[PDB]
């Protein structure tokens, strides 16, 4: 499923993402935008280390979900990567919360540093009623 901007903002708010571990909703929106374009079935294989990023938040198979074919894999979020390709983002949100519980926080995603950090991100939630 490809979410509409405001539709996604309200969904993540309802799921308790606003201010989770000090991370504003505008920042989670900025992250989803640049990681998958708000697309739940987005997947990206990393030829270099043989891991795959899954879903709307591009969650990695080496640390957060299990896909069976990733070398030196662990299951921190303890989920099958399959769950992160669903139209319902509840599991992807629970996994994203797990990622930010580590000291790095939102910085875990390099894309967040390049396109969101230290920027005016209000544009991601403006007009959405959140």
Swiss-Prot record:
InterPro entries in the record: Glyco_hydro_22 (IPR001916), Glyco_hydro_22_CS (IPR019799), Glyco_hydro_22_lys (IPR000974), Lysozyme-like_dom_sf (IPR023346)
Enzyme class: hydrolase
Location of the active site: 35, 53
Disulfide-bond pairs as recorded: 6-128, 30-116, 65-81, 77-95
Secreted in keyword set: yes
Entry's Gene Ontology cellular component terms: azurophil granule lumen; extracellular exosome; extracellular region; extracellular space; specific granule lumen; tertiary granule lumen
Catalytically driven reaction(s): Hydrolysis of (1->4)-beta-linkages between N-acetylmuramic acid and N-acetyl-D-glucosamine residues in a peptidoglycan and between N-acetyl-D-glucosamine residues in chitodextrins
Gene3D superfamilies: 1.10.530.10
GO MF annotations in UniProt: identical protein binding; lysozyme activity
EC identifiers of the protein: 3.2.1.17
Domain C-type lysozyme intervals: 1-130
Source domain of life: Eukaryota
Record-stated family: Belongs to the glycosyl hydrolase 22 family.
Further remark: Lysozyme C is capable of both hydrolysis and transglycosylation; it also shows a slight esterase activity. It acts rapidly on both peptide-substituted and unsubstituted peptidoglycan, and slowly on chitin oligosaccharides.
Record's subunit section: Monomer.
Disorder this protein is connected to according to its UniProt record: Amyloidosis, hereditary systemic 5: A form of hereditary systemic amyloidosis, a disorder characterized by amyloid deposition in multiple tissues resulting in a wide clinical spectrum. AMYLD5 primarily affects the viscera, and the predominant clinical features are renal dysfunction of varying severity, and intra-abdominal bleeding. Inheritance is autosomal dominant.
Protein name, entry field: Lysozyme C
Organism field: Homo sapiens (Human)
């Amino acid at each position: 499923k490809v979410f509409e901007r405001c539709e996604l903002a309200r969904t993540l708010k309802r799921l308790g993402m606003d201010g989770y571990r000090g991370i504003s909703l505008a920042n989670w929106m900025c992250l989803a935008k640049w990681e998958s374009g708000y697309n739940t079935r987005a997947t990206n294989y990393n030829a270099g280390d043989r891991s795959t990023d899954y879903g709307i938040f591009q969650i990695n198979s080496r640390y957060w979900c299990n896909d069976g074919k990733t070398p030196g894999a662990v299951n921190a979020a303890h989920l099958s990567c399959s769950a992160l390709l669903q139209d319902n983002v509840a599991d992807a949100v629970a996994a994203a919360k797990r990622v930010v519980r580590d000291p790095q926080g939102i910085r875990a995603w390099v894309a967040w540093r390049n396109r969101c950090q230290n920027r005016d991100v209000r544009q991601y939630v403006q007009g959405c009623g959140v």
